[PDB]
Ligand binder design. Structure first.
Ligand SMILES: NCCC[C@H](N)C(=O)O
Ligand SMILES: NCCC[C@H](N)C(=O)O
Ligand SMILES: NCCC[C@H](N)C(=O)O
Ligand SMILES: [Mn+2]
Ligand SMILES: [Mn+2]
Ligand SMILES: [Mn+2]
Ligand SMILES: [Mn+2]
Ligand SMILES: [Mn+2]
Ligand SMILES: [Mn+2]
Lengths: 310, 310, 310
């Protein structure tokens, strides 16, 4: 039971500052101590310095191609994450990656699927993060991870993204908590027939059923390895006051946590990402002690922490 | 696919000011643009000036009969709504009426049922709005609409309400979200065996099931036309901070919206009212950008807006 | 239909001040008037003066045995509650006990089970309140009631607790709403195979199902008498801003109240405690008008108050 806590302080797909501090902030909440307690031989893994990267981020303002922003910077860092996470996996360690915006999933998913090819991917998020290079209206790369992993709009994908392995197939990615999907993305999910569970399904069926469905969706046979990429903005703002992309009708804190428990309960979780943690963006005290307190909770629950005896 | 957005700035059943501004406020949120986007040929229909009416409202303080207040003023305006909504319907247009307190439903329901006789009525509200003229303790007419449409307490109903057609039958009206029913009203619903779904049923069965039930209740045959009269105070205050009649245990914003989706999904919605929108009553910024933001959302969802591809 | 409203202003298991004012505060909300209205011949029963007890509480700082605090004071007062509640029961009256911290359940449960031996016990709480004398880390007795009633850790239980009857068996106590269980307690529930329903079960199954289960758990035959000991901290803080022991993921106000309705609906409720009501701890106005407004609501609903005709 070895685990590697991958620290990815990247704020590319994200505008300015805030989301790079997540890794450190989480670790301060005792994230590693919690993991050790749950019985995990934990080892940290710093893929790069958030302070330096954040630096070049601000200065370097000419990293663009179309409306797409920071292709070079984002391609450079996500490749390092891929490599790191890939080794961690090969070494037989569990990759727990702490972001950082959701653009890091480009290196995490690639990393995990490279070693675990038949692994399913449950994307817990309010957004589909599947805009293509030419489709993206905002150009923020944290909303285009999936389009790149799935190889959509190949023609328009940068040279700096040639390092991306084509290991993710549409029937291996399921969404949970969607409620802010762009028109372009709605057609994409439909056309590729991607198992997408929006807030409608949670309201209609309840979380338990949705998780069961999402799990079945990426697991033809009830034995496949499973990876969850958890965006904390999935959780309704009321619960995630310290983030940067929420809307009307998110998951309750209870649902957000129960979901984890059902996953831990499954017993086939192979990797986990926790992203979009912005302590700064929220000038209150119950705000900063949330996206990081929430992050640790998600981590603890995902990793087995239960309410009763286990 | 033609629609007529009926503007009814009436604040009769309502004490003083606030609820007459709803129509304009909604339109400012781009309500008509949203409707056009959803593919509706929309045409506005001003039934009267809220500024003038509001005026005579304040001055004219002697409009009473028993504890009942503003019978004359309320009978005068609701008849204009009836007429308007009736034509809109006959012209084959969809009546989307924006209030204004719930006393306008006296003219909306009458209008719609005059043209669509076998139409069912789903009253989404925290209150039953069925107090009789002699039964009403507060005399506020926004809490007596249904008693008049159903012809209860005929003897004590004013001459100014002679214009009201008797088109609504007890087995054609279903409630959803009830939690502030007056003793008198509880006996009335029971005696007339009206399908009433309070917050108890939502807690016990979940919203999806309740909507299904409410829909079945007013649709002997699964083909009848359906009309929803949506009171925004049904939504728990936490979600409707800008209204004027909520209590302990309302619908969540998610439920409030999912309900709409199930209705739009049904495909038999023939008319829709959105009432009790008081921007003023709530001195905050997330308050005024709610009962109007909520109203538009309800409208968009009721009219087909979905989270995924459609 | 006779009822005795037992006033227990005890703040032993509780640190300093606040929770002793609950009884008076509730009565001010018209608790007795509400009970009378629901058709209950109500009679108050003051077991002791909260002002005097609170007094000796502060001064007397040497009441200890191990980490356990106020054993003498807590043993003295809870015995008076037991006696009172026992008579009330024998007189055929319904004991509605208002605390006061949850340490009073030591005298309530004993009192009720003495007269109604086969009575089941539904403990609605965020905590298990089952730490043993030697197990308790904090020494606060409000977290050790159940260990004493069940006779756990006999060896280390004080002489001042010799008055406690051994009437409660493990298969006669069910939990609902658990989410803050100490490691020691988790093993205890498991080992004694106590029916425990945490927030996981509520999220997974919904409240209705949980209550049904809890009721079945303590009722081998669907006829046994039932007692509920309601800790208001079970209700998520958002709803219980005026308490002193909540965490992440409590019951919604709706659930908290629906639960009562299902219980009242059952028809076999024989006793009821409402505890952990701290008006003071919460310097707001919607806070103090909650743990007391909530308490009365719980009482009204538990005692039959419904949303529709009954
Ligand atoms: N990761 C959030 C995505 C937000 C939006 N769809 C975008 O493309 O920027
Ligand atoms: N429309 C709100 C109704 C409130 C109350 N039942 C009344 O008759 O005034
Ligand atoms: N009644 C609240 C219990 C809190 C904690 N388990 C304790 O033993 O103090
Ligand atoms: Mn994302
Ligand atoms: Mn997102
Ligand atoms: Mn109404
Ligand atoms: Mn209403
Ligand atoms: Mn307790
Ligand atoms: Mn407790």
């Amino acid at each position: 039971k070895k685990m590697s806590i991958v620290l990815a302080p990247f704020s590319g797909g994200q505008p300015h500052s805030g989301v790079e501090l997540g890794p450190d902030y989480l670790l301060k909440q005792g994230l590693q101590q919690d993991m050790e307690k749950l019985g995990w031989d934990t080892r940290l893994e710093r893929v790069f310095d958030g302070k330096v990267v954040e630096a070049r981020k601000a200065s370097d303002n000419g990293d663009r191609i179309g409306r797409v922003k920071r292709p070079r910077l984002t391609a450079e860092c996500t490749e390092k994450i891929y490599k790191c996470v890939r080794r961690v996996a090969e070494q037989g360690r569990f990759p727990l990656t702490i972001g950082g915006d959701h653009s890091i999933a480009l290196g995490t998913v690639a990393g995990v699927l490279s070693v675990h090819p038949d692994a399913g991917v449950i994307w817990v998020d309010a957004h589909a993060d599947i805009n293509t290079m030419s489709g993206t209206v905002s150009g923020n790369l944290h909303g285009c991870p999936l389009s790149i992993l799935l190889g959509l709009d190949r023609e328009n994908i940068p040279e700096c993204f040639s390092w991306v392995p084509q290991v993710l197939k549409p029937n291996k990615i399921a969404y949970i908590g969607l409620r802010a999907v762009d028109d372009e993305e709605k057609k994409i999910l439909h056309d590729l027939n991607i198992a997408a569970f929006s807030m409608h399904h949670v309201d209609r069926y309840g979380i338990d059923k949705v998780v069961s469905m999402a799990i079945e969706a990426v697991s033809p046979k009830g034995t496949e390895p499973v990876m969850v990429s958890y965006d904390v903005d999935t959780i309704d703002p009321l619960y995630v006051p310290a983030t940067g992309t929420p809307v009307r009708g998110g998951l309750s804190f209870r649902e957000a946590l129960f979901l984890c428990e059902r996953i831990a309960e499954c017993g086939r979780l192979v990797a986990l990402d926790v992203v979009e943690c912005n302590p700064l963006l929220a000038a209150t005290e119950s705000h900063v002690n949330d996206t990081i307190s929430v992050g640790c909770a998600i981590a603890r629950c995902m990793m087995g922490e239960t309410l009763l005896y286990t």
